Amino acid sequence: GILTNKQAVARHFGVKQSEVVYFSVGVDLGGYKVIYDKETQRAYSLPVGIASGTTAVSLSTAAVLVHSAGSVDLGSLAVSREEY
Amino acid sequence: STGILTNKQAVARHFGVKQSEVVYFSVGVDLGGYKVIYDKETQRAYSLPVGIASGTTAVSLSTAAVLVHSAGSVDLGSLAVSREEYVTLPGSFDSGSTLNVKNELLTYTDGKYRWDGILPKTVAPGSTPASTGGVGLGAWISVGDASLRTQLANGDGSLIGIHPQGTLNNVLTVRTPEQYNAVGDGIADDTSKLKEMLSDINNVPETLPDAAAVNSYMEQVAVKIDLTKLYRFTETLYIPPGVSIEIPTSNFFTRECKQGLFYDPVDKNTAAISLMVYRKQPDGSYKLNKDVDYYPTGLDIDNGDAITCARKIDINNLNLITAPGVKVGVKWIGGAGCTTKGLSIGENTGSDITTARLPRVGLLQSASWGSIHENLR
Amino acid sequence: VTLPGSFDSGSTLNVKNELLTYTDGKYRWDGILPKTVAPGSTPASTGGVGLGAWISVGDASLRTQLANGDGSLIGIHPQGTLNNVLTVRTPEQYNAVGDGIADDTSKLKEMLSDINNVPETLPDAAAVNSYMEQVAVKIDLTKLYRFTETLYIPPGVSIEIPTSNFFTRECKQGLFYDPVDKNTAAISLMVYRKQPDGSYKLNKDVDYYPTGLDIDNGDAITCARKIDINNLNLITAPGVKVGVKWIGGAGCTTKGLSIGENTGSDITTARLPRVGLLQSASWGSIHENLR
């Protein structure tokens, strides 16, 4: 279920299945390349350089991700990456 | 197991092919009939060339996606490039990355790029395409819409083909003040823009070491200028050598000048436009004449006291209006062999001459042997 | 959906959103479906590109369309497209180097040829006279082009440079004639001479000039008209016999034609010709401010 979705998202972005993480409060974001929002059913490339130990605080409907080390508008990152 | 089947589906839906058309790479697998191949180790998929005979089996698949099979070889990365089937790597030139396949793109602040050189390619953090090989064959190649927009915006027209052959940059040779964002309403002060436009053509220093120095400036590429709007300026413009000025038509007793130059200085005891003549200094150097009343004599030209820097200047329909009270319109000094057609000075503002936009003295000329003024108004 | 294969392999399109990859980008079929594409096909050989046929799709296709077009994809003000206003020609369109070092001869010749390609041999009077009834085109020379064989200007040509040389020490824009055989002319208009068999051959003899009589009795036929020169700068290697042969140019006009370079004090090494200009059979010809 979650594993097949990870496969689908991974193939869309060209990453490994293990490089996709689902958002949840407290989830560790270190090392993942793509994050998936199970509520909106949208995926986003993660900014590079998120250290192991950095956990997710919140993810808005506008794709603003707040975590331990700060925050990132995944929407803006996706635009820069032409991922629409 | 069932994971393989679901993965084939994900891949199939991505490329728009059938689930049965996806094959996993493995030494010895039959490649015949399949449309897409999947590398389970790198977890990357590639469209396969059409025409693989049935019974043809896989031999090896490199991390650069070069596939060797029983009937030959094929670079799947190159094929992917031709089919615009790309993978945008995480990160960017700023973060750094390592590319292994020809169909991998790295994001830069102005668009994406693929690497056309030797693979693998390592990009250190803080890099730019420029600092890591440059753009062009065998190096970085611009890819995608965002990259095309920025290239078009920051180029010279080389991306635009024209007839019978060649590109747009090959035929764009005229300059305009609009390239420098001049307002052209005869109200805003466009002086700095006009001066930059001229400097970009022939930038001659106001002070020069010797005669050889001043003379070198008459040996530069000449450029044509097109003035289609009205430009207000407030300091004397000095036309450098190698300049052609053009305007569609010449004014003739016009009440309201709409195209050309409008000189509106604080100090009216000056000239609107002047050619360049350098005067000898005590120390032996030369300074550009900036004195309104100065004009060089034949003697000066022989004494070395004056050196002209007015040559290869052509004027076509230049209209020059001036604020009332301005002393001189045009100082045609040292312009030997320089020519003029339809030069039109002054505006027929209205009945009262004291408020008309024309100068006290229209044109003052010296040291201009061989110059021709055709239909001067 | 980008179909497997390509135009090389051939394919069959069934839906409007299917793309077929070619060497310069992708295309969708805008005509009747299904559409069969035989192996070894090209968009141009299977319907052409345009409404109702192959339609270019995607960024790769856009790049090649723009790169090989005429500017018709670029809108301009107040209306129309870029190709509607691009009328001038330049040696740069033909990749001339323009440094006055490289031999740009074939490029210049190709530029002239693309305007009016006049054969050096013609059957009769009517044939040569036809080349004077062709569309005229303006040429802009903004760099310095070295060439090594006499250039023959065909009728219907306008040549301009931003300014005219004047006792110029180092020519930067114009033509520099630098041949092996210096007993030649740098530039010449076209005059055809009658042959024993009645046919006509282009004059390529440096000393030849047609007489009024020649033109009258058909011994010579001019192919020099509708030619206008504004500011052409022509310098040449020291020792070149003639700079410009203005022969048979009736009604042809010139303004600011500037011949020769003020290279240095030694006239023996100055880049100027022995004879600047030689003119005959050019009634009604006007040279304004010739240098």
Residue numbers in the entry:
A (entry chain B): 14 to 97
B (entry chain A): 12 to 388
C (entry chain C): 98 to 388
The authors write:
In contrast, CBA120 contained multiple genes for putative TSPs (TSP1-TSP4), genes that are more commonly associated with Podoviridae rather than Myoviridae. Analytical gel filtration of purified TSP1 revealed a single homogeneous peak at ∼252 kDa based on regression analysis of gel filtration standards (data not shown), suggesting that similar to all other tailspike proteins with known structures, TSP1 forms a trimer in solution (predicted 82 kDa monomer, 246 kDa trimer). The TSP1 trimer assumes an elongated rod-like shape of approximately 170 Å in length and 75 Å in diameter at the widest region.
To identify possible sugar binding sites, the crystals were flash soaked in high concentrations of readily available mono-saccharides (mannose and glucose) and di-saccharides (α-lactose and α-maltose). Of these, binding sites of glucose, α-lactose, and maltose were evident in the difference electron density maps. The binding site is located at the periphery of the hole generated by the D3-D4 intervening region, adjacent to subdomain D4. The amine group of Lys662 forms hydrogen bonds with both the C1 and C2 hydroxyl groups. The backbone amide of Lys615 is hydrogen bonded to the primary alcohol hydroxyl group of C6. A water mediated interaction bridges the backbone carbonyl of Glu639 and the C6 hydroxyl group. A second water molecule bridges the backbone amide of Glu639 and the hemiacetal oxygen atom of the glucose.
